[PDB]
Amino acid sequence: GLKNPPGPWGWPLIGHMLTLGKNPHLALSRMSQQYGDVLQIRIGSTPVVVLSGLDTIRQALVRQGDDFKGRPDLYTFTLISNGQSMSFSPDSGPVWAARRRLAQNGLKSFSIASDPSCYLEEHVSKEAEVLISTLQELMAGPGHFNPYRYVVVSVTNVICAICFGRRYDHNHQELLSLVNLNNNFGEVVGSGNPADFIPILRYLPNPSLNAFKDLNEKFYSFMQKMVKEHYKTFEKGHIRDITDSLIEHCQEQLSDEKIINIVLDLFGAGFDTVTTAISWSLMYLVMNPRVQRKIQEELDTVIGRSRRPRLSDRSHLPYMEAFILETFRHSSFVPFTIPHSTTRDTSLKGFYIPKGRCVFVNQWQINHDQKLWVNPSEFLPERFLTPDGAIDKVLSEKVIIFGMGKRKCIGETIARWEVFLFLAILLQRVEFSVPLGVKVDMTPIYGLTMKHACCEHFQMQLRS
Ligand code: HEM
Ligand SMILES: Cn1ncc(NC(=O)c2nc(-c3c(F)cccc3F)sc2N)c1N1CC[C@@H](N)[C@H](F)CC1
Numbered sequence: 001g002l003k004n005p006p007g008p009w010g011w012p013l014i015g016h017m018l019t020l021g022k023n024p025h026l027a028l029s030r031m032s033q034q035y036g037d038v039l040q041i042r043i044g045s046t047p048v049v050v051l052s053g054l055d056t057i058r059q060a061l062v063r064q065g066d067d068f069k070g071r072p073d074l075y076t077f078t079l080i081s082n083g084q085s086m087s088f089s090p091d092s093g094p095v096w097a098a099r100r101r102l103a104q105n106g107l108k109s110f111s112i113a114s115d116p117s118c119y120l121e122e123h124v125s126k127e128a129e130v131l132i133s134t135l136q137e138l139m140a141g142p143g144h145f146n147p148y149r150y151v152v153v154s155v156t157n158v159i160c161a162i163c164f165g166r167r168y169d170h171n172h173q174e175l176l177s178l179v180n181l182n183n184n185f186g187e188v189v190g191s192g193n194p195a196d197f198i199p200i201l202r203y204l205p206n207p208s209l210n211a212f213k214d215l216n217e218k219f220y221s222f223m224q225k226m227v228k229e230h231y232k233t234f235e236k237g238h239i240r241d242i243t244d245s246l247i248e249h250c251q252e253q254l255s256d257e258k259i260i261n262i263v264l265d266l267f268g269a270g271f272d273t274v275t276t277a278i279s280w281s282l283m284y285l286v287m288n289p290r291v292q293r294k295i296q297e298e299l300d301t302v303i304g305r306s307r308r309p310r311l312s313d314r315s316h317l318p319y320m321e322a323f324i325l326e327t328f329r330h331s332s333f334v335p336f337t338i339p340h341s342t343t344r345d346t347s348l349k350g351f352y353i354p355k356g357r358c359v360f361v362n363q364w365q366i367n368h369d370q371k372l373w374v375n376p377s378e379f380l381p382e383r384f385l386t387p388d389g390a391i392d393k394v395l396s397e398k399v400i401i402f403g404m405g406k407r408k409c410i411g412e413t414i415a416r417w418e419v420f421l422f423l424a425i426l427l428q429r430v431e432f433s434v435p436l437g438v439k440v441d442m443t444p445i446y447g448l449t450m451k452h453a454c455c456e457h458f459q460m461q462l463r464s
Contacts, residue, residue: 015042028041047358049353084258165241227260
């Protein structure tokens with residue numbers, strides 16, 4: 001038959017906003033244990049459908065994805081990339097698909113293809129060596145360092161080369177104001193931002209929204225700066241990065257602006273996400289050092305100690321694909337996808353969802369469903385390993401964090417390689433640790449990309 005999505009009772013004026021609280025991915029998980037995979041809330045006057053459960057989500061984003069491929073018109077998204085973002089604008093028709101395919105292409109052309117030896121491979125090692133040299137310096141003087149300030153540059157340098165052909169040192173000024181001065185949570189985009197549903201909070205004293213409205217103007221400046229320095233030195237046959245790749249196309253509807261700001265779409269996604277991933281990894285390595293050995297033990301068995309890991313080795317290091325798989329899962333640092341929206345009156349598991357309905361996708365619920373994982377709160381990479389030491393290719397596919405369907409991540413490949421290549425080169429020549437007896441807050445901080453309370457105590461050691 002056909003029924004309306006269930007849900008709990010919400011306040012008439014504000015809705016369930018007082019129930020979501022500060023960690024919606026948790027609040028909405030406990031709901032899904034009561035109302036299931038399809039449930040309905042209201043934030044202010046706007047109703048929202050929260051999709052949970054692995055198979056329920058697969059049914060909507062992939063099989064019926066053409067019905068769920070849209071984005072709601074939220075206030076915060078109008079501020080990103082001049083309200084014309086490929087990823088966040090309400091545009092989802094042909095105009096958008098054209099921009100995605102140009103994005104996937106510019107990546108495959110300056111990320112995967114060979115360098116006249118892989119593009120991504122050459123860069124990651126480039127900044128990995130630098131990163132190591134740079135961390136040694138802090139062990140010399142201060143003795144202790146915060147791993148984030150330096151990982152973010154080293155990560156940013158990579159995505160920044162694939163896009164603008166430039167690299168910046170770890171103590172630059174313009175870049176730390178760009179990708180690090182923010183040193184905040186990233187929450188005004190995290191699904192459930194009250195300003196998107198309570199119109200008044202946009203005009204009231206809101207510094208988080210002022211630090212955010214400003215950080216975007218700064219980002220959109222760095223784009224124009226590079227687009228011009230690239231058009232000042234542009235050769236119609238010699239393409240040097242995704243930036244050049246886009247310019248070349250503006251010559252061949254699609255405003256010149258909706259094509260160029262795409263390189264910003266890759267750049268803002270790149271540095272933010274992969275950085276967090278590597279940061280969390282260090283936090284785990286430092287917290288549970290058995291995994292620090294069992295991941296080194298593999299690294300000294302497959303390849304040696306007089307060999308820098310190449311990108312061809314990710315296949316034959318299963319314990320590391322496990323650690324990656326677990327760090328993605330246990331943290332689930334992308335707990336919600338970017339909110340979706342129904343493109344037409346559709347149905348899911350017997351429920352009616354009308355056209356235009358804001359929908360949340362609770363990736364955090366899948367990665368911590370006790371129905372699937374035995375002990376979801378424990379960090380145990382060993383849960384992905386078959387009795388013969390290999391990766392269980394059906395459970396690794398149940399770790400959801402890049403999305404599904406027509407809107408999934410276009411840099412999943414590049415994120416998985418980059419996160420494995422960065423980790424390999426370090427730990428082979430490095431023993432991260434933290435002195436016993438200090439506070440390390442492993443608690444996550446809600447946001448689009450969840451972060452952690454920065455830690456200034458890490459100590460890198462050179463191996464035997
Ligand atoms: C661990 C790292 C990463 C994670 C967890 C991640 C996750 C995601 C998620 C959950 C979405 C949206 C899902 C949805 O809309 O339903 C997304 C979209 C996107 N991602 Fe990533 N991503 C990562 C790295 C990257 C990288 C390295 C790039 C590019 C260099 C990238 C580029 C994009 C873009 C352009 C979109 C927009 C999707 C669209 O507009 O259709 N991501 N990513
Ligand atoms: C392409 N692109 N250009 C600009 C962005 N935005 C930011 O980096 C960003 N800064 C944020 C922030 C902050 F730094 C400090 C204080 C408060 C804040 F709110 S919140 C957010 N989203 C993006 N993406 C985001 C990452 C990825 N996961 C997406 F899926 C796709 C693209």
